[PDB]
């Protein structure tokens, strides 16, 4: 048993060392998970701590019963930690951790209902800007939060949960864009919402790739330049289009050249200064 602290300690060390910048922690945290853990963990640096926090509840899945209750005891501490901490990476970590605590069923529905974290998931869910990666953890959190409630008889949270309704505008967007990944996440929210509270609530194709190619055909939107006063001003204005990579054509014997519309303005500015 004297060995136990030492071995696991070395991995605690490794995680500590490359704790700050990237996402090294995930694999190592898992190993750490098996072997007042939460109380002691709290002192350690946040990232990675959260990673360990995330995976440990997952890992639980007799003495096990004891473990769950023990975890339930300091669910608050992690919750206090979760907020306050609140990049995309961090954001992913906070909801992933929250989601994980939720499936454990340790979290108190009350308390959760009135908390910043629930506002934050729908906030990111609402905004178009968030990336697909943030979206999936946000979505998962919501799903898990609703999953946590297997009652709704006594669950204030299943009120705030209603915040999903706000999402429809977001789904309209997303749909407008070809973001299939952003739509699927929405559907999961809907389906899960219905699930919890459902009781309460009332060759041939060769011509088709050719027909696709008929919808693509080229030309470019473009400025032409002519009647240039002397050769040095063609060559300067031409070299300064070529380094901008927006020369479509050039002919030095014409003293004539062509720029596509996206670098009309960098040329209009260079023509004014020098």
């Amino acid at each position: 048993p004297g060995v136990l602290d030492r071995l696991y300690g070395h991995p605690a060390t490794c995680l500590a060392v490359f704790r700050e910048l990237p996402s090294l922690a995930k694999n190592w945290v898992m190993r750490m998970l098996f072997l007042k853990k939460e109380f002691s963990k709290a002192q350690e640096e946040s990232t990675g701590l959260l990673s360990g926090l995330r995976i440990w509840h997952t890992q639980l899945l007799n003495l096990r019963i004891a473990l769950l209750g023990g975890g339930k005891a300091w669910s608050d501490d992690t919750s206090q930690l979760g907020p306050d901490k609140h990049v995309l990476h961090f954001m992913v970590g906070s909801p992933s951790a929250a989601v994980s605590q939720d499936l454990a069923q340790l979290l108190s529905q009350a308390g959760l209902m009135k908390s910043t974290e629930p506002g934050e998931p729908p906030c990111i869910t609402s905004a178009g800007f968030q990336f697909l990666l943030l979206d999936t953890p946000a979505q998962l959190w919501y799903f898990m939060l609703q999953y946590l409630q297997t009652a709704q008889s006594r669950g204030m949270d299943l009120v705030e949960i209603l915040s999903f309704l706000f999402q429809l505008s977001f789904s309209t967007l997303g749909k407008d864009y070809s973001v299939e990944g952003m739509s699927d996440s929405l559907l999961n929210f809907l389906q899960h919402l219905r699930e919890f509270g459902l009781v309460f609530q009332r060759t041939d194709q060769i011509r088709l790739w050719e027909l696709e190619r008929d919808r693509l055909r080229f030309t470019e939107g473009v400025l032409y330049n002519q009647f240039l006063s002397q050769v040095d001003f063609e060559l300067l204005l031409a070299h300064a289009r070529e380094l901008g990579v927006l020369v479509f054509e050039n002919s030095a014997k014409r003293l004539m050249v062509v720029t596509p519309a996206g670098h009309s303005d960098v040329k209009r500015f260079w023509k004014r200064q020098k």
Binding site: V222, L223, F233, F248
Partner: protein, 62 residues
């Protein structure tokens, strides 16, 4: 040499189709407006608004 600028569309067609567009330009009704000039055999300065028409007409035509 930044004497003159002209927004136009530069068409980079092949040495086969280009003359077809030219033909489109002439012998046509409400046309001849289409091509500003032939900068190269491959490229032409053309249209703007006409580009939709030129492409479509080429499509419809053989």
């Amino acid at each position: 040499m930044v004497n003159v600028l002209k927004g136009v569309l530069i068409e980079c067609d092949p040495a086969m189709k280009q003359f077809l567009l030219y033909l489109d330009e002439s012998n046509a009704l409400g046309k001849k407006f289409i091509i500003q000039d032939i900068d190269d055999t491959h490229v032409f300065v053309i249209a703007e608004l006409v580009n939709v028409l030129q492409e479509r007409v080429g499509e419809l035509m053989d």
